[PDB]
């Protein structure tokens, strides 16, 4: 008589394989608004 060869693979042996790592490369590139150039052009030079 033959031996029924043991096929069997547990939960811990089956149901996860090493996943590919998540592809993350994205910073928050913020274009700076340039400082709005200032003429609240003062009193002395403004009127006299």
């Amino acid at each position: 008589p033959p031996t029924l060869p043991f096929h069997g693979e547990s939960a811990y042996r089956t149901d996860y394989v090493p996943k590919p790592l998540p592809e993350v490369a994205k910073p928050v590139e913020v274009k700076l608004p340039p400082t709005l150039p200032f003429n609240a052009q003062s009193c002395y030079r403004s009127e006299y």
Partner: protein, 428 residues
């Protein structure tokens, strides 16, 4: 520094601990031999050339299911002292496991838990997994919690049991093992979660469509509860819920620490990519009164606190709407001394596919652990069975022979009876 020590006692504890320790190991990516080809620190040490070793203590008195661990594929990942065995089993006999054959393996277990806790820069909690209804899970496990409470105090002892199911039990003497193990689960346990087997059968046969599930498939969904419960321990998210956060928002009074589980994005291929699984859909199915993992229907109970742990690409405002629509539903009722009754956690790491498994790719998940007065029926169900069997003293000659008097039975029914009494006085 975040570090949870798992202690798996009993044959069932070894098997559910198997399916757990692969959402711990190679979800972190480590190979079967123990090499990644520091998020692993939640469950693993590190021994030089990339060897991370599980922070587990395997306990059994029969050396046949732990010997499968020593001979399986994963024999070189476990250290060959973390798989502690015995010479002879406990045989559904609470008094053998606690008084006679327990006091030769407990001294080895406390050594390995010592060497695995002095390798700790701050231990979050002992996640001990057992099976109430057997001999070494109800016996040795009860003695383990009593010894761990005296020595290792003030840090949590989250216990997920395998409480005997109402009809299906595959034993006859399990009421004696359940009622007399209630003492450890009521005093020497910080968080207890009832988790039977029929409800996992029902989830597998209704959502997951596997009409013939085996214990290996039951260990699947138990493991997915554990990974989502410690998800914020290891991975970032919008809100984190560690094991100290968990017990402080779900335990109203110190004696009441019993909860229910549900992890219901349970989908499988044909029922997976057809259904849009949004945050509202998975939250409604989590609160649904058939996916509770205890046969513990809460439609006749009062909710007390909930611990919805969203996991994946979940947006916090979608969590906010999902909580709101549960509150407006009338059959989901809450006790009156709790206007805020949810502890929402969000993980960023998505749940993991299973090759050869039962689930599939899902981008989001929920795992809510909820305390309710509905959990008073899982103990009153077994009050009927203990009362019938102890009437004419069946099976008592076993339990009395090796070292407990018959008054242990009466005081444990008294401990059970004072137990359900505290639920209806809290609910009313």
């Amino acid at each position: 520094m975040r570090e949870v020590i798992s202690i798996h006692v009993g044959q069932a504890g070894i098997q559910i601990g198997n399916a757990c320790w692969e959402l711990f190991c190679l979800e972190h990516g480590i190979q079967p031999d123990g090499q990644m080809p520091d998020a692993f620190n939640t469950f693993f040490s590190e021994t030089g050339a990339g060897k991370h070793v599980p922070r587990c203590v395997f306990l059994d008195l029969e050396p046949t299911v732990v010997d499968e661990v020593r001979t399986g594929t994963y024999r070189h990942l476990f250290h060959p002292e973390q798989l502690i065995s015995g010479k002879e089993d406990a045989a559904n006999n609470f008094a053998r496991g606690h008084y006679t054959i327990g006091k030769e393996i407990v001294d080895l277990s406390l050594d390995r838990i010592r060497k695995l806790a002095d390798n700790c820069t701050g231990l979050q909690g002992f996640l001990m997994f057992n099976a109430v209804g057997g001999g070494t899970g109800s016996g040795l496990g009860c003695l383990l919690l009593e010894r761990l409470s005296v020595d290792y105090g003030k840090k949590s002892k989250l216990n997920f049991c395998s409480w005997p199911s109402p009809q299906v039990s595959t034993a006859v003497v399990e009421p004696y093992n359940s009622v007399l193990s209630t003492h450890s689960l009521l005093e020497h346990t910080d968080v207890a979660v009832m988790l039977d087997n029929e409800a996992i059968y029902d989830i597998c046969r209704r959502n997951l469509d596997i009409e013939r599930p085996t214990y290996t498939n039951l260990n699947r969904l138990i493991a997915q509860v554990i990974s989502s419960l410690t998800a914020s321990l290891r991975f970032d998210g919008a809100l984190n819920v560690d094991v100290t956060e968990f017990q402080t928002n779900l335990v109203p009074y110190p004696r009441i620490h019993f909860m229910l589980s549900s992890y219901a994005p349970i989908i499988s291929a044909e029922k997976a990519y057809h259904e849009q699984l949004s945050v509202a859909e998975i939250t409604n199915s989590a609160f649904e009164p058939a996916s509770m993992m205890a046969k513990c229907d809460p439609r006749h109970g009062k909710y007390m606190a909930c611990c919805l742990m969203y996991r994946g690409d979940v947006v916090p405002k979608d969590v906010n709407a999902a909580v709101a629509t549960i509150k407006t539903k009338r059959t989901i009722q809450f006790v009156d001394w709790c206007p805020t009754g949810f502890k929402c956690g969000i993980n960023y790491q998505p749940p993991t596919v299973v090759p050869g498994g039962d689930l599939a790719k899902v981008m989001r998940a929920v795992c809510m652990i909820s305390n309710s007065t509905a959990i008073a029926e899982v103990f009153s169900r077994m009050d009927h069975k203990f009362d019938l069997m102890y009437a004419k003293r069946a099976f008592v000659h076993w339990y009395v022979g090796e070292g407990m008097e018959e008054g242990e039975f009466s005081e444990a029914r008294e401990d059970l009876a004072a137990l359900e009494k505290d639920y209806e006085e809290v609910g009313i």
